[PDB]
């Protein structure tokens, strides 16, 4: 799925159709983008068989299950309250979960796509979310090094940070990937805000 924001009056969307056929929807609205566009990373839009609907598709991912779609269930995918219509861009479900995300971003103190913003606000947004990520891994290792008891020393602390984070997240809490998922979707929001400037 490829959202190409052209001149800031509209956009174009590249999606799959049938068995990996290429289709593009022009005249895609960029205002009220919150409604229909999924911020998940675990889902993507696909042109319906009779192409007048954009319907969800669950991607291979260990991310949480948003939009009520857990496994590409056709009875949910074809439902009108779980898919968008080309022309009247609702969602829906997508709007609910995305509003929840925009609530999370509000909690963190990050600029949201619902209210006014410029390039500066978005730049500050990414700059802050970076701090959030760094702090998150820092805490994920901090509250992890309590077992020890002195096994750390200068043997464990050997390279690398990738290895350290791997061994630390290996037995980390289950909520960590939920928070990471939230931050991912928020990141996608900030990205949408960035490309809209």
């Amino acid at each position: 799925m490829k959202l190409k924001i052209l001149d800031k009056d509209n956009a174009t969307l590249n999606v799959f159709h049938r068995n990996k056929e290429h289709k593009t929807i022009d005249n895609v609205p960029t205002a009220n983008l919150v409604d229909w566009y999924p911020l998940s990373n675990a889902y993507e839009y696909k042109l319906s068989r009779n192409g007048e609907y954009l319907e969800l598709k669950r991607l291979r991912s260990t991310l949480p299950s948003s939009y009520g779609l857990d496994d590409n269930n056709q009875d949910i995918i074809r439902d009108n309250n779980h898919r968008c219509k080309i022309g009247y861009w609702y969602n829906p479900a997508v709007r609910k979960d995305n509003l929840k995300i925009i609530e999370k971003a509000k909690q963190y103190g990050l600029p949201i796509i619902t209210e006014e913003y410029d390039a500066n606000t978005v730049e500050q947004g990414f700059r802050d979310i970076g701090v959030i990520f760094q702090s998150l891994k820092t805490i994920v290792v901090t509250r992890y090094l309590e077992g020890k008891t002195e096994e750390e020393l200068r043997i464990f602390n050997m390279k690398s940070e990738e290895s350290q984070l791997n061994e630390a997240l290996k037995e980390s809490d289950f909520s960590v990937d939920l928070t990471y998922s939230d931050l991912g979707q928020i990141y996608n929001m900030l990205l949408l805000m960035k490309k809209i400037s």
């Binding site: 799925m1 990373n41 291979r60 260990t62 990520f133 984070l165 990937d177 990471y180 990141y187």
Partner: protein, 61 residues
């Protein structure tokens, strides 16, 4: 290379442009590890490395 990336990422799906972007930290400024990016997109590190191997190789032909 900074100007070529913004066109090379426009030839990739959004979900790949975003893993490369998060990893290399374009707008983020800072750099994200393979594990962090893998956690953000819910996929293993090897896969992310495959995306990198697909994108960085596109800067040739």
């Amino acid at each position: 290379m900074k100007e070529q990336l913004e066109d090379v990422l426009d030839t990739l799906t959004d979900r790949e442009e975003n893993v490369l972007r998060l990893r290399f930290g374009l707008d983020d400024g800072r750099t994200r590890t393979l594990e962090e990016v893998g956690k953000v997109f819910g996929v293993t590190r090897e896969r992310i490395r495959q995306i990198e191997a697909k994108a960085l190789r596109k800067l040739r032909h």
